[PDB]
Design a protein around this ligand. Sequence first.
Ligand code: 4ES
Length: 213
Amino acid sequence: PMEEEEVETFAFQAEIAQLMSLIINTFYSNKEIFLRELISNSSDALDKIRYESLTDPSKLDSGKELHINLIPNKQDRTLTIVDTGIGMTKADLINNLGTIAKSGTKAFMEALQAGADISMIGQFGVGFYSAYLVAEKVTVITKHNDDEQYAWESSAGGSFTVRTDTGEPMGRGTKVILHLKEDQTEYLEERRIKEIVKKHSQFIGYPITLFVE
Ligand SMILES: Cc1cc(-c2ccc([N+](=O)[O-])cc2Cl)nc(N)n1
């Protein structure tokens, strides 16, 4: 082959699988809130590396710039959210993206069913799964200091994969790649992305840059 590598398959924790199944099927009107949830996670990841750099400036040797990039790609039908935050070790990725029950999961589930604003429920990492409101597949690329670059992927269905990433090296941070549903291509439009950022993520303390082609 052109390339080959080992790929690990993990089953989602029962409550996480239930949450994903609910997000994928529910009629939820305010789907645009997925972007707020991912930008909030990136903001928290940027706060963490920034905090660690106060007592150890060498933590930013992998990149001083603390920011968020939004990258729509009409050809691949993908929307990517990139940050230069703390990133995730392999253990961090397996633990935080599927194998462990998370705080805010029940609140998220109940808010979805009630048609409530899942944003006003809290600042929970689990808000990540709102990506499946607009995407059929999510790929997460991540790089933590003193560790290798890893790739997580899931099209839901009860399982996810983890492998060493062979793509373009990141200095540090996390890339969330949304493979958008055919009927959700408005989130590739520059005008729409600007509107959603201004409406729900206007007061983020890091620059947000849109890559337009
Ligand atoms: C370090 C880190 C972690 C996370 C994250 C945090 C929590 C989840 N989650 O599914 O709970 C998913 C992700 Cl991908 N997101 C970013 N942007 N950066």
